[PDB]
Symmetry: C3
Subunit: 134 residues, 3 copies
């Protein structure tokens, strides 16, 4: 049943139209409809994100991760994620391939099961549906 | 009146001749002379720096930012700064163009109003004077 | 007598055969045999690692540093380490030259006294022995 949705730096600033709290609500509702339980967490702290990934590794739970800027920069986060035995779906709200070159490189994509970008907040919901059907 | 001066990693080690406390004193005095209030904050924690940038975004206040090593490495910090509606002045005490190649690239400069480097601690004071006259 | 052994992100996950606690035990025992005192610390937080490096700088104590993913990414950590007056030995358990290209670049190596990689946990013990004989 359990899927961990982990949001990284700046994701708490969503909507300041959809706020981060509203995103949590949308994800939780969709998870319920799919027979899952979504646990949604956000932090601007890499160490906090690492701890949540460690917990998912210990629990053998899947992760939907939007790491924000750390996607492009953090080897530590990638390496934490490499311990996950369950699927890892990388999500970006924006199309990271449509702006600065540096955003087109992700440390996470090579070790993720898959990646969804540019489909807005629905990307999280589509990631949930992937996990439900697998 | 209010200008946020935000110092990143290692800036607390200044003078260990001018210490970070002495830098705060110099900035506060100059701000007073210019009819401004400077709020000076330093942290080695990226998450703390992000929170201070978020607060400046919410308050529509300008920021003078010396991000230390994060200047060259942090997309998360750049992205937080992109939310600022008021001016962002990037400051470096040292001339970052006169040593290692990696220091000559800043994630902040492309989104800053302007950048002052190599003028020592006076760089902060000159940034204050820019904001006062604008 | 005192050598600071500082472990960065993900090192707390060792053995989850040798756990991080067992690594601490092995290092402490070897330090004792060499007439040293090893102080072993681990954190997933860059800010915490920076504080431990600052303390070693203030105490003029040597550092054996395995920075984990931050080895490849953190200018802030490198810059903190540049304040150290005593030796800095960079250690990696794995051979960082035998996998992804990005692991073959270290911000720490150019400012370290030396570097040991790929010799497993014994790398820490060999670093201790270097410091003991110098
Ligand atoms: O597309 C993403 O999900 C992304 O992982 C791309 C990543 O390159 C960037 O650091 C980021 O962080 C930069 C941000 C921009 C922004 C705009 C409006 C409200 C909040 C935020 S946070 C985000 C996260 C995004 C969320 C929404 C659009 S991008
Ligand atoms: O020039 C800067 O302001 C800079 O943002 C350049 C940046 O590349 C570097 O990570 C850093 O951080 C490296 C440091 C060096 C140093 C030397 C003496 C006392 C404190 C510090 S902290 C600094 C910050 C600087 C402050 C003073 C000189 S450079
Ligand atoms: O070789 C190292 O010491 C290294 O600094 C290499 C570095 O590139 C990597 O981020 C890391 O962090 C990735 C990790 C992998 C792993 C595997 C088994 C148990 C724990 C960990 S943590 C480590 C630290 C390592 C420890 C053991 C093997 S690599």
């Amino acid at each position: 049943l359990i899927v961990n949705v982990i949001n990284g730096p700046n994701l708490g600033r969503l909507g300041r139209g959809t706020t981060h709290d509203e995103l949590v609500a949308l994800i939780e509702r969709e998870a319920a409809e799919l027979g899952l339980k979504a646990v949604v967490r956000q932090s601007d702290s890499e160490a906090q994100l690492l701890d949540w990934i460690h917990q998912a590794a210990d629990a053998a739970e899947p992760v939907i991760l939007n790491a924000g800027g750390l996607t492009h920069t953090s080897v530590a986060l990638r390496d934490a994620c490499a311990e996950l035995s369950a699927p890892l779906i990388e999500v970006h709200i924006s199309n990271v391939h449509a702006r600065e070159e540096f955003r087109r490189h992700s440390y996470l994509s090579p070790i993720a099961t898959g990646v969804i970008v540019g489909l807005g907040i629905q990307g999280y919901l589509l990631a949930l549906r992937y996990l439900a059907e697998h």
